[PDB]
Structure formats: structure tokens, C-alpha cells
Write a protein that binds this ligand. Structure first.
Ligand SMILES: *[C@H]1CC(=O)C/C(C)=C\C=C\C(=O)O[C@H]([C@H](O)NC(=O)/C=C\C=C\C)C/C(C)=C/[C@@H]2CSC[C@H](C1)O2
Ligand SMILES: Nc1nc2c(ncn2[C@@H]2O[C@H](COP(=O)(O)OP(=O)(O)O)[C@@H](O)[C@H]2O)c(=O)[nH]1
Ligand SMILES: [Ca+2]
Ligand SMILES: [Mg+2]
Lengths: 57, 419
């Protein structure tokens, strides 16, 4: 009976932990995809600044 | 004097209910526990099975789900049982020996022992216990053998007797029956003094081939069983000389402690006509009237008890019983002299002027263990269906050990068959 309790508990534990690790990895990945996208868009705004500066000469 | 009766699980409660209906009728006890019979023979040994102007079965009803015990309570003699003697859980055992023996059964077993103790404690001189169960399910098999072990610990000098229904593929509920039966047989070998082996395949074939019932129900099978249980307990329950208590029966029937598995039989079994003592005797010894699906001509009798019931010539009984032994002497081991004993009770079963019941300790019972062993191995070699057991905490090694122990039993029977 102790063995059966232990293995049920260990199953819960491992399922809990695996899920926590996937939801964190997923979150960091999604965030990074978004941050990269926004950084490209910001490079473009900086480039448009330079164009308008280049025009002023 | 007193025997305490325990019935566990679906099969165990269903046959146990029928046993109590049948013996209550024989002892003149009505469904309200009142005595309305007309022979003092009925009451002389009533306290063996009944506490006392009412008579109440010394019976404990156990299960891990409520349904069969609800039917018992509603059934014919359902109000005769003491209400405190119904002990049941809710979760069930799922046809799983591990659930009965180790997990669910473990939660309920102490409450069963409380009731066992209360019944034992008002006994003037408890002789021991009789348990009805199947070996193929979860509760009767796993929890029933757990109970037997716990009773032995608390009453180690009392006799333990079982009526144990052995599974068959031909009359089967689940594929895991051979696992549950192998695990149980290992317990019975160590912890019972006497086990009546009742094969569901034998019951079916008797119903189908001999009784001409086209489609047998469990009800049909249990009718057979309850008739046989009545026959085999006759000498416990009525005045007499021979096998009159559980311990005397064991001393006469069990020459080696492990070889305590008996093949019972009943006669008559036919599809109004008078039966003769010759006919009873011949039918009682015929393989087709025996309830373990083993051919006694494939082995030898170590010991036999025969019980005749009804008005009949004691002289002709002794005569025919000597004819069978003298005519078939090779099937009786010669190194146990006078190994067949005969009792006679005047009271017949209901509906019959005359009957006979056979209890054989035959080396042919090896065939029943071998069959279960082969069905166990076919699955266990592929570890099939084991997850149901391992999920309750059991290890494979316990299955290996049960299989070995049952194969050992088979070898032990073979040795004495050859001796
Ligand atoms: C249970 C009986 C019941 O539900 C239905 C009826 C009406 C009868 C069943 C009879 C039966 O099974 O009988 C066998 C056997 O078939 N009978 C004979 O062979 C009779 C005469 C032979 C002459 C040559 C015997 C049997 C198992 C009877 C038991 C005794 S214990 C109580 C049950 C009642 O019947
Ligand atoms: N003879 C007979 N066999 C039964 C009966 N009910 C179940 N069985 C058999 O018993 C085994 C299943 O065990 P069961 O008693 O139903 O399970 P439990 O309730 O967990 O003990 C199988 O071998 C079935 O064929 C019954 O009323 N009579
Ligand atoms: Ca539980
Ligand atoms: Mg069942």
C-alpha cells in the first residue's frame, strides 16, 4: 500500500513539474518571438529618422 | 460446537444466501427466524450455525460494493441475518485481487474482524470458520484470503474451511480470473484446513449436459452449489458419529497439510421415480456428478467421505459402499487402509426422498490447478493485464512466487499418485 501511494504521488508530482516547465518554456519562447518582431519594427523607425535627417542636408 | 460463517464478494454472498435459505428450510427455520418444524433432530445441533424465541445465522456478509448485499437483504431469507453483520464498502474491487487484498480490502477488513470477534466471543466453544467466495474476482478472492490470514492470526488454533469457486474460461467475467485464482490458491494452501473446490465449468456442464438446461444462469449454478453445501455440512448440523465436527473431518480427510483440496459431488442429478441405494451410490462416484472438472479415474483417492440422506437400508448402504471400493480398488491408495468413511442422516434435502453427497481428496484435483496454471502462464509470459495489479503496488515477483507455489502443489499431488 505504501508503494501504491508513493507511485500515485510521484505520478502527480512529475505531471505537475513537467507542465510547469512547459508553460514557462512556452511563455519565454512566445515572448522572445514578440520582442524580436518589435525590435525589427523599431529598427525601421530609427531608419526613417535617418532618411528624414538625410533629407535635411 | 459453534461455526462462524463468512461470505465475501458477489459470488460468495450469492451462494452464501442460497446456503442459508436451504439449511434454514431443513432446520425448520422460517424467514423471520421462527422455528416451525416437527422433528427434534432439527434443533439438536442448531446452535452450530444459529444463535438464539428466534434463531439468527452466525453469518457475516462482506463486500466492497453494496449491490449484492442489497439484493441479499431483499431476497427470500434476507431479513433473517443480523443487520450489524452486513459489512460493506462502496468503491468495489474491479475484479482485482490486489484491490481486495492490499488497497480497498485493507480499509474495510478491521471492521469485518470486529464483527467476527463479536460472534466468536458469544460462542461457548467455537470450532472454527467457514468462508464462501470465488477465487476469480477481487473481493471474495483478495479480500477473502486477507480475512483468512487475519483470522488465523487471531484464532490460530481454530479450523478454517472454505467453499471456493474456481474460475473457468467457459463461464468467465474477465480475463484476469487466472491471476486472481493463482494468487488466492497460494493463500489457501498455507491457511485453510479444508477447501471444497467448486469449478464453475463443472457446474455449467452438469446444468447443460445432465440437467438439460439449454442456457444456465449463475442462479442455476448456485442451486447446484447450495445443494452440495447442504450435503457436505450434514454431519456438522445433525446428530451422528462420523466427521461430526470440523477438526474430526480434517483428521480423517487430510493426510498431508497442503493436500486439503476436496472434489465434492451430489446425487441424484437427473433431467418422481424412486431412487435405489445402488443408483445413488453409482451416481455419487461418477465423474459427471462431481463439481471440480477433474476425472477421478486420472488419479487416486487419498480419502473419501460419503454422506447418505433419507430413509434407506443402512445394510444396503454399507453393502454398496463396500461394492464400489472392492470393485474399483485401484483408484484408492492402498497405503491408507479403510480410507472411505460413510455417514447416514435420516433427514433428506427438500424435494428428494434420498440423496448422497461425496467429498473426495483425490490426486486428480491436480488437473484443476494445472489448468489454472496454464491460463496464468499464457498471459504472464507477456505480462499481459499486469498494470491493473502493479498500479495497486504489487510487484511481478509476487506473481512468480504464486505460480511456483501452485506448480509445487501440482507436483505434490503427482508424487502421491505414483506412490
Ligand atoms: C431448488 C430447486 C428449484 O429451484 C426448482 C425445482 C422445481 C427443482 C430442481 C431440482 C433439481 O435440481 O434436482 C436435482 C436432480 O435433478 N433431481 C433428481 O435427479 C431427482 C430424482 C431422480 C430420480 C432418478 C437435485 C437437487 C440439486 C436438488 C436440490 C436439493 S437442496 C434444495 C434444492 C431446491 O434442490
Ligand atoms: N457459481 C457462481 N459463480 C459466480 C457467481 N457470481 C460470480 N461468479 C464467478 O466468480 C468470479 C468473479 O468473482 P465475483 O465474486 O463476481 O467478484 P468479487 O465480487 O470481487 O468477489 C468468476 O469466476 C465468476 O464466474 C455466482 O453467483 N455463482
Ligand atoms: Ca480506499
Ligand atoms: Mg462479479
Amino acid at each position: 500500500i505504501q508503494k501504491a501511494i508513493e507511485e500515485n504521488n510521484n505520478f502527480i508530482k512529475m505531471a505537475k513539474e513537467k507542465l510547469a516547465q512547459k508553460m514557462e518554456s512556452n511563455k519565454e519562447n512566445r515572448e522572445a518571438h514578440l520582442a524580436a518582431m518589435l525590435e525589427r519594427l523599431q529598427e525601421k523607425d530609427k531608419h526613417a529618422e535617418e532618411v528624414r535627417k538625410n533629407k535635411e542636408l | 460446537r459453534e461455526i462462524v460463517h463468512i461470505q465475501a464478494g458477489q459470488c460468495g454472498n450469492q451462494i452464501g444466501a442460497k446456503f442459508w435459505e436451504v439449511i434454514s428450510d431443513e432446520h425448520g427455520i422460517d424467514p423471520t427466524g421462527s422455528y416451525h418444524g416437527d422433528s427434534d433432530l432439527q434443533l439438536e445441533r442448531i446452535n452450530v450455525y444459529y444463535n438464539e424465541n428466534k434463531y439468527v445465522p452466525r453469518a457475516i456478509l462482506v463486500d466492497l460494493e453494496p449491490g449484492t448485499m442489497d439484493s441479499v437483504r431483499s431476497g427470500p431469507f434476507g431479513q433473517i441475518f443480523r443487520p450489524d453483520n452486513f459489512v460493506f464498502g462502496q468503491s468495489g474491487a474491479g475484479n482485482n485481487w490486489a484491490k481486495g487484498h492490499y488497497t480497498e480490502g485493507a480499509e474495510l477488513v478491521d471492521s469485518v474482524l470486529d464483527v467476527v470477534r463479536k460472534e466468536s466471543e458469544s460462542c461457548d466453544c467455537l470450532q472454527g470458520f467457514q468462508l464462501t467466495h470465488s477465487l476469480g474476482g477481487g473481493t471474495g478472492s483478495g479480500m477473502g484470503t486477507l480475512l483468512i490470514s487475519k483470522i488465523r492470526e487471531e484464532y490460530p488454533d481454530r479450523i478454517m474451511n472454505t467453499f471456493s469457486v474456481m474460475p473457468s474460461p467457459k463461464v468467465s467475467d474477465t480475463v484476469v480470473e487466472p491471476y486472481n485464482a493463482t494468487l488466492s490458491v497460494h493463500q489457501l494452501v498455507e491457511n485453510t484446513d479444508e477447501t471444497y473446490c467448486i469449478d464453475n465449468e463443472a457446474l455449467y456442464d452438469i446444468c447443460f449436459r445432465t440437467l438439460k438446461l439449454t442456457t444456465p444462469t449463475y442462479g442455476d449454478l448456485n442451486h447446484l452449489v447450495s445443494a452440495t453445501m447442504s450435503g457436505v455440512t450434514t454431519c456438522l448440523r445433525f446428530p451422528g458419529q462420523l466427521n461430526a465436527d470440523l477438526r474430526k473431518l480434517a483428521v480423517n480427510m487430510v493426510p498431508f497439510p497442503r493436500l486439503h483440496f476436496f472434489m465434492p459431488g451430489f446425487a441424484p442429478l437427473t433431467s418422481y421415480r424412486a431412487l435405489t441405494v445402488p443408483e445413488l451410490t453409482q451416481q455419487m462416484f461418477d465423474s459427471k456428478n462431481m463439481m471440480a472438472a477433474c476425472d477421478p479415474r486420472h488419479g487416486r483417492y487419498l480419502t473419501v467421505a460419503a454422506i447418505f440422506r433419507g430413509r434407506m437400508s443402512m445394510k444396503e448402504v454399507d453393502e454398496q459402499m463396500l461394492n464400489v471400493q472392492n470393485k474399483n480398488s485401484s483408484y484408492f491408495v492402498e497405503w491408507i487402509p479403510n480410507n472411505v468413511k460413510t455417514a447416514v442422516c435420516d433427514i433428506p434435502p427438500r424435494g428428494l426422498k434420498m440423496s448422497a453427497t461425496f467429498i473426495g481428496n483425490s490426486t486428480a484435483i491436480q488437473e484443476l490447478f494445472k489448468r489454472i496454471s496454464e491460463q496464468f502462464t499464457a498471459m504472464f509470459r507477456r505480462k499481459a493485464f499486469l498494470h491493473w495489479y502493479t498500479g495497486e503496488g504489487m510487484d511481478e515477483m509476487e506473481f512468480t512466487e504464486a505460480e511456483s507455489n501452485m506448480n509445487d502443489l501440482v507436483s505434490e499431488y503427482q508424487q502421491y499418485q505414483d506412490a
